[PDB]
Enzyme design. Structure first.
Site, PDB file in Angstrom:
ATOM      1  N   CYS A  41       4.773  -0.404   3.204  1.00 40.62           N
ATOM      2  CA  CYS A  41       5.190  -1.733   3.634  1.00 40.62           C
ATOM      3  C   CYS A  41       6.598  -1.753   4.258  1.00 40.62           C
ATOM      4  CB  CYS A  41       4.951  -2.761   2.535  1.00 40.62           C
ATOM      5  SG  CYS A  41       6.228  -2.796   1.256  1.00 40.62           S
ATOM      6  N   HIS A  60       8.419  -4.352  -3.088  1.00 43.84           N
ATOM      7  CA  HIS A  60       7.692  -4.726  -1.969  1.00 43.84           C
ATOM      8  C   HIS A  60       8.672  -5.314  -0.934  1.00 43.84           C
ATOM      9  CE1 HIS A  60       3.685  -6.094  -0.530  1.00 43.84           C
ATOM     10  NE2 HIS A  60       4.538  -6.833   0.219  1.00 43.84           N
ATOM     11  N   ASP A  73       0.831  -1.221   0.000  1.00 45.85           N
ATOM     12  CA  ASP A  73       0.000   0.000   0.000  1.00 45.85           C
ATOM     13  C   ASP A  73       0.872   1.281   0.000  1.00 45.85           C
ATOM     14  OD1 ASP A  73       1.134  -0.103   2.459  1.00 45.85           O
ATOM     15  OD2 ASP A  73      -0.713   0.316   3.575  1.00 45.85           O
TER      16      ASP A  73
HETATM   17  C1  J5S Z   1       6.511  -1.133   0.261  1.00 41.06           C
HETATM   18  C2  J5S Z   1       5.166  -1.082  -0.412  1.00 41.06           C
HETATM   19  O1  J5S Z   1       4.109  -0.830   0.185  1.00 41.06           O
HETATM   20  N1  J5S Z   1       5.206  -1.339  -1.736  1.00 41.06           N
HETATM   21  C3  J5S Z   1       4.012  -1.231  -2.549  1.00 41.06           C
HETATM   22  C4  J5S Z   1       4.251  -1.258  -4.045  1.00 41.06           C
HETATM   23  C5  J5S Z   1       4.092  -2.466  -4.744  1.00 41.06           C
HETATM   24  C6  J5S Z   1       4.305  -2.465  -6.126  1.00 41.06           C
HETATM   25  C7  J5S Z   1       4.622  -1.271  -6.802  1.00 41.06           C
HETATM   26  C8  J5S Z   1       4.830  -1.299  -8.291  1.00 41.06           C
HETATM   27  C9  J5S Z   1       4.760  -0.055  -6.106  1.00 41.06           C
HETATM   28  C10 J5S Z   1       4.561  -0.066  -4.712  1.00 41.06           C
END
Ligand code: J5S
Length: 225
Positions: free
Chosen positions: A46, A219, A43
């Site tokens: 993370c 992620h 989201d």
């Molecule tokens: C760390 C986090 O929440 N990442 C989320 C995310 C997943 C996938 C993409 C393309 C951007 C951000």
């Protein structure tokens, strides 16, 4: 368990990249060194949510390390005030972080800690606290971030746009800053789709890690050695 999952076997994430040669190779290699994984919701929060949960989980049952961490957390309001944050505007976020630290001390269970981090309200208050502290620690050490990261960057604008707001993605600077701000030693494993070696970085460089994270498809998930 919509924000942080139950533990799964490491090889369970093959299904996320079916019939992909390079992901299959690197996940198999990763499985030689780690036994289990927890997934986090993607989201934009993370990194903060994963680091927060995994580090407090690593403290459970350790009475000296809990005492020392509580001592540091009690001083963080001074970091926020030195960087220009106002107490009446950080109070609700600090109080939620202090409360989960006392939970680690008083309750001491994985189940109770996992419930707080899967409570949208409590978990988001925790993440916002960690974002403000990251910002404060960068702002209070601006010459260090300019000297060692990037002599050309605008520190105040960077913190305003890419650290404080919910759902903004991290980079090396935010990871280094929150690691130093709470004295958390962490190792990040990198799995991309290039035909390269599985590799990792430790923050800070010298250290024995408390926390292991997997960075894959933008992620951060939690690893268990
Ligand atoms: C760390 C986090 O929440 N990442 C989320 C995310 C997943 C996938 C993409 C393309 C951007 C951000």
């Amino acid at each position: 368990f919509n924000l942080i999952s139950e533990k799964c076997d490491i090889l369970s994430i093959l299904r996320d990249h079916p019939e992909n040669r390079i992901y299959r190779r690197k996940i198999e290699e990763l499985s030689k060194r780690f036994t289990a994984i927890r997934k986090t919701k993607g989201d934009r929060n993370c990194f903060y949510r994963a680091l927060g949960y995994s580090y407090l989980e690593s403290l459970l049952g350790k009475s000296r390390e809990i005492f020392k961490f509580k001592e540091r957390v009690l001083q963080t309001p001074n970091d926020l005030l030195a960087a220009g944050f106002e107490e009446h505007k950080f109070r609700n976020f600090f109080n939620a972080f202090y409360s989960v630290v006392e939970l680690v001390e008083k309750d001491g269970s994985v189940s109770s800690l996992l419930k707080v981090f899967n409570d949208q309200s409590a978990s988001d208050h925790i993440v916002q606290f960690l974002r403000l502290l990251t910002s404060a620690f960068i702002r209070n050490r601006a010459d260090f971030f300019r000297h060692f990261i990037d002599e050309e960057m605008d520190i105040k604008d960077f913190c305003t746009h890419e650290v404080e707001p919910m759902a903004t993605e991290c980079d090396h600077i935010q990871i280094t800053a929150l690691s130093q701000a709470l004295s958390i030693a962490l190792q990040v494993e990198y799995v991309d789709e290039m035909d390269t070696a599985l590799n990792h970085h430790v923050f800070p460089e010298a250290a024995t890690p408390s926390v292991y994270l997997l960075y894959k498809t933008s992620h951060y998930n939690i690893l268990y050695a």
